[PDB]
Design an enzyme around this catalytic site. Structure first.
Site, PDB file in Angstrom:
ATOM      1  N   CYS A  30       0.812  -1.208   0.000  1.00  0.00           N
ATOM      2  CA  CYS A  30       0.000   0.000   0.000  1.00  0.00           C
ATOM      3  C   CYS A  30       0.854   1.270   0.000  1.00  0.00           C
ATOM      4  O   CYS A  30       2.012   1.254   0.404  1.00  0.00           O
ATOM      5  CB  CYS A  30      -0.931   0.014   1.214  1.00  0.00           C
ATOM      6  SG  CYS A  30      -1.970  -1.453   1.381  1.00  0.00           S
ATOM      7  N   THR A  31       0.260   2.364  -0.464  1.00  0.00           N
ATOM      8  CA  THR A  31       0.833   3.698  -0.369  1.00  0.00           C
ATOM      9  C   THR A  31      -0.278   4.617   0.124  1.00  0.00           C
ATOM     10  O   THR A  31      -1.398   4.531  -0.374  1.00  0.00           O
ATOM     11  CB  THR A  31       1.342   4.200  -1.728  1.00  0.00           C
ATOM     12  OG1 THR A  31       2.171   3.192  -2.332  1.00  0.00           O
ATOM     13  CG2 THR A  31       2.125   5.489  -1.563  1.00  0.00           C
TER      14      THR A  31
END
Lengths: 461, 461, 461, 461
Positions: free
Chosen positions: D1-2
């Protein structure tokens, strides 16, 4: 062409030097070294290319020249020294632009490089007179080419550039300065108030009245009348740059494509004939732009070199000051691509020239220095790194021999009853040794090269 | 050739050092280590190459030398130390130019490298006397080569360069300085009135009166009499650069092609014999110009290395100051390409030399150190990275053994009844160990290398 | 080998750390973790390699050690902690030079790495005493190797380097400093008068009286006694550089070949055991010199890495200060190439060692941690980028588990009636977990790796 | 994820923004957009993965969510906005280290990303309350993962990071700041007593009493509790770097591998939703690390991109301040790899969600936006440069259409008697046009792409 000019305080020996590579369209075109005695000079001159007709004075001076052997397109004398010790080289083809051509177009029946030395050099007694006479002839007859022309005497060096069909400008190279000039208009900042400049009387008005000046202040002639094109960045500017890097390394940046390199330069040392010949023979050595070097194929072929296959002759015209006037004028000369020849210091004060340099024809003859020198350079080109050590040895050996002959000849000049015969003998000695050393070099190349032919198979025992 | 000079305050032990790689044209040419006793020295000398005939004094001193085994081209003694503890090495071939050669040409029946140690070293009792005697001989007999010659005693180190057929100049290396000199004229800034210089009595007049000086100020001898050519940038300058980068890293820039590297330098530390041998064995290690390295084919072959296949001998002549004069003179010596040999500290104060170093002939003999060393370096060259660890081990092991012998021999010198016999025994021990270790190295290379031959096929079990 | 030393104010927990990769010549050589109880320690010691005979005191202390399983060349105990909580690791092979070897040669029947821990560690109660005892033994028996040895207790860390056959010098590492030391002499600037240094009583005199000092000012021991070779630039200096770049990024330049990197350094943060293991397992990650990285073949193989196939054991000896003395000594240990193992924090205060770490023989046995760890690293080496994520997961998971066991064991130390049995049980738990996680890692690698074999052909459905 | 966080003074419109790419292990895993009304919220919650049992309050608020279609591993709601206009996204998997895991191990039957939104979001009325509730639940139940969680309301934005099994810390993002956070612990410099921070009541003591702090001064939480690994340099830091280069170009250096990039940043301009989606869709455009770019194969694959094949959903949760509370909460949403989708601004104040976003199952259905978006991105990936112009046209066209619907809906909000029906109609219009434009894009890609298939042979006439 590439030209190099050196003022009398910038040379190692206090001489003036003007020089040029006389490059043609075809790689080979035989050249002759010829003295034109006054009785052989025309009074009614007609050109071959433009059919311009010029009546000439009846008192021409003797002069050296480098006419084409094949006269189909006219004489093409290139350069020489007259009996007043004035030197002239014509021409360096330069550039122009559409704005000035729209105002003063080329003149189809005007003068050209075919003609200029023949119609100017015999009739002037100083470099300044040369400039003024050429200017007068351009104004009167016009021209069909954009040209740069050098003049020198024992005091001054001048550079004249032609502008459109009839206009021109000229600058005196400062005594302590040099110039490297490629095939691009060169004169930059120009002072209309200076004693060191000359030009068409209407040149400033031409500029001012026709919106020709692109600069906000002052006058830069090549900005106004010349080019700064993409082609200039590969054909012209790198040659200027390489010469300036050699003579003025601390004043010159690392961009060969630079459009505003100075015209007038000041070297970090005094300049020798050997220095001038090196630059005139160069091919961007120790850069990626060297066609004989280690760069990529595209880098190696990006720039036009100074030494080149179509060097027909190279001349360095020297007017010396450390000697009596009868031996002051030296017409240094070589033939063919400059990578494998040497310039020979011929005395200009003679009535005739040596056979190995005078007698080239359209027939291939390896007893002649034009054909022999071309043959040597072609073989050298096939494997430069293989032949360059022999080349370098030959250059030192030959130039040393020439200078010994010059020094001996100079030393015994006093009291000579027949100066011209004395100097013709010296020139014969120079040409004889030049031929012997050129021939020995080619022989050494052929012998060593034959050992390295592709068509070989040796037993290694 | 490559030469390295070290003043007495610049060395780690307060000795003077002069050194040279004696490089030939052919890769191999057998060398001998020979003491010339006075009775063996000619009084009426004639050279083979030039047939120069020199009558010599009747009181020659004993001296060491490194003559060629094959005498077809003369003796070629290269270098040695005489019984006054004066050292001399001749020559470093340097460069010249056409302007000075045109004034003072080579003398074809003059002196050469073939001759110089033989006609100078036995007759002088100081380095300065060596300089003056050689200068006088050049004036009397002339020379046919451009050469650099080193002289040293326990106080001073001098470098002489020959100029044209008869002229010369010499500089005393400052005590705290070193020099690295390749095949290019080296002397730069030159003060004629300095206590540290000697030269032809007419040298300044020669320059001033013949427009030889290219500089606006002062006198730089290699600017005047030497070269700054394209070939110098690849053949010469990088060797100077690499040595100076090693000894003076913070005073040296990153351009190996630089034409104006200083002649006289000051290192950031004191210099050992090991240091000198390293530089004399080098091939631009840790740069792209290392032929054994990671660079492109063109970069790897662009520069002439210092260690090279045609190293015939390498000598480091040391005059020590921390010992009695009878053991002050050390003639360090090795043979063949310097990558796979070690210099051995032979005492010069002896009447004869060890058999493994004295007796090479034109017949291949692996019991002789010339042939054994060449064989080792050739094998090493075929896969340098494979053999270099054995090489490095051997260098440390061998030099350690030599220094133990030198230290033991030095320690027991007092009271020796026959010094020459004592030192001949020491030299015998040195040569015996040098041979055993060279042989063991080659054996280890052959054993390990044979496992890695192309002609192999192993079962991996 | 590569060694890392950390002073008590430089560590994250106020402990002292000394560490080393025990690298061999052969890739694999089985290692054991062994406690030598006093009754099993020799009083009449004879080495296998040198046949040196050393009479030892009759009151040896218990100590941990890492002896070779195969005793052909002697015990080779490598490193350990004694019951006074003194740590010792011997040795880091360093360098020397021919000038000092010529004065104080190796002693062939002297002490070596085979011997040093065995003859020093059981008999000293401080790091300083360890230094002094080793120094005394070198003087009495001599040595045949150039070695660096680390000592520590809960207060001090010392580094001793051997010099020739009998000489030595040692430095106390500042509390707030660290050292990274490769196979090169390390001690630089040296103050003879400081309480932080110890050395041969004659060391300064040896230097001063024998012209050993290459520097104009002061004393740098590795300048004097060590090396600065071309091989150092690829074998040694880059390891120092990489470690210093990791701990002192703002004080370290970008040249891995630098010969004068500092010995004593100061990190920008406190140092953990995890940090030390990272550097000891490294292969120039994120540079072109990483053999598992993206560089050219030549760049990838230019430098000797720190983690390497011939890591036989890695040990980090920790003397803690945040705990009672009975649990202060931690002998962190792993086997095989450091890329695929983890160090396990064994309590040193024990009478015996865990079976999976004690029982390697020359027979391949994957139930033993030496063989299991080697197998894992070899498989990992075949496709590092494919296996590295599992490796990273394993490192965190295993180190977390070890620290939980250590934290629990530390927390319940109070009131333990039999400390050694309590800690032997803790070590068994550690070793059991270490084996289970090493085995699970290899299993996961084999399972995933098998899916990616070359010998495959899948239907993609 | 970011994840990307934006404070209310940092956004172009004065809203708060919290966002995340919800990335999975497998590329595809169908997602649904679902409103959980209070009647359907569990009071007795049991997770699937850990079997943790949590009794929940009997007064849950309605909330948006993004549950997995396939419930094999639990709900995985990802993110949403509740009826108090509080936003939450859980989780960003972060990093930890062995020193803190050794003190507070993961809890196997604890809470995880599977659970967090479900057990926190319905029960809190501010971002701060969200932080505190999550903190309490971690203390009560523990966790088995290292996670970062964002919270927002119309005033504040918070970032919470979990530490070991039970500990945690949280920072309020300054109003004028933004954050880009990858899969690495992010919180740096930390003030325990600040009103802008919250944490475990024992966090400072945990650090101080167990020697966890590696720094000489102050507290940096990711230095203490997180990682700075080699894997971070390629998996994590370049994503942070690329985002900071985009928003803060003049404050960000050129090293993507930097381990100490700031957590809290200040952009050189106000930030739009379009900006956030660009960064969340990025693949290092205009660098050598772009997998679709011109770099080497190794450079192109060195870094983990932000837009990626395993983007399952992307959400940007916006709490607006330029509108009445009834329309303040916007749940921007897209599915599949972010290179070929657009976020759609769904109003969160609804009781149900549009069918094209709600009704994905495990059966492939191109009438559903999850499967349609994934199909588009896969095709685009096969020839990115060929399809990117259509992609770019589609993004502008679609986002323009969404904004027009949002602006019209916002403008007509006053007096709407049934707010949920009004906003459900708006969301239906949004989803309808999003589907039509996504479908038109794929159609255009298929039509143009088919012309360029490998399996073709055209007559060019």
């Amino acid at each position: 062409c590439t030209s190099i000019l050196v003022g009398k305080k910038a040379s190692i020996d206090g001489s003036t030097l003007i020089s040029r590579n006389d490059d043609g369209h075809e790689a080979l075109d035989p050249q002759r070294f010829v003295v034109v005695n006054p009785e052989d000079q025309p009074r009614d001159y007609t050109s071959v290319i433009s059919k311009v007709n010029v009546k000439l004075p009846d008192d021409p001076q003797r002069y050296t020249s480098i006419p084409n052997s094949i006269l189909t397109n006219g004489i093409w004398p290139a350069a020489g020294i007259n009996s007043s010790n004035v030197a002239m080289s014509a021409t360096e083809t330069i550039t122009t632009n559409s704005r000035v051509q729209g105002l003063d177009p080329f003149v189809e029946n005007g003068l050209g490089e075919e003609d200029l030395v023949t119609v100017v050099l015999p009739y002037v007694k100083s470099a300044r007179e040369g400039v003024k006479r050429l200017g007068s002839l351009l104004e009167e007859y016009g021209t069909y080419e954009p040209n740069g022309i050098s003049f020198a005497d024992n005091e001054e060096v001048w550079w004249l550039e032609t502008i459109g069909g009839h206009h021109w400008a000229a600058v005196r190279i400062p005594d302590d300065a040099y110039v490297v000039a490629p095939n691009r208009m060169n004169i930059d900042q120009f002072d209309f108030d200076s004693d060191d400049t000359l030009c068409s009387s209407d040149l400033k008005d031409l500029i001012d009245n026709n919106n020709l000046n692109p600069d906000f202040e002052n006058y830069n002639l090549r900005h106004i009348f010349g080019s700064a094109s993409i082609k200039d960045t590969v054909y012209n500017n790198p040659r200027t740059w390489y010469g300036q890097k050699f003579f003025s390394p601390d004043d010159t940046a690392d961009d060969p494509m630079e459009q505003d390199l100075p015209f007038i330069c000041h070297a970090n040392r005094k300049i020798s004939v050997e220095d001038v010949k090196f630059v005139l023979s160069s091919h961007f050595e120790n850069t990626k732009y060297d066609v004989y070097g280690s760069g990529s194929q595209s880098d190696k072929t990006l720039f036009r070199p100074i030494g080149i296959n179509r060097n027909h002759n190279v001349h360095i015209l020297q007017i010396r000051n450390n000697v009596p006037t009868e031996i002051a004028g030296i017409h240094w000369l070589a033939y063919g691509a400059n990578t494998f020849n040497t310039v020979v210091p011929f005395y200009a004060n003679v009535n005739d020239t040596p056979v190995q340099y005078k007698n080239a024809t359209g027939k291939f003859d390896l007893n002649n220095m034009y054909w022999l020198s071309c043959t040597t350079a072609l073989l050298g080109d096939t494997d430069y790194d293989f032949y360059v050590d022999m080349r370098n040895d030959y250059e030192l050996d030959a130039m040393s021999a020439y200078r010994k002959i010059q020094n001996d000849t100079d030393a015994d000049i006093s009291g000579q009853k027949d100066i011209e015969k004395y100097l013709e003998n010296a020139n014969k000695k120079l040409a004889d040794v030049a031929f012997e050393k050129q021939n020995k070099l080619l022989g050494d190349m052929v012998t060593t090269g034959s050992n390295n032919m592709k068509l070989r198979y040796n037993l290694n025992d």
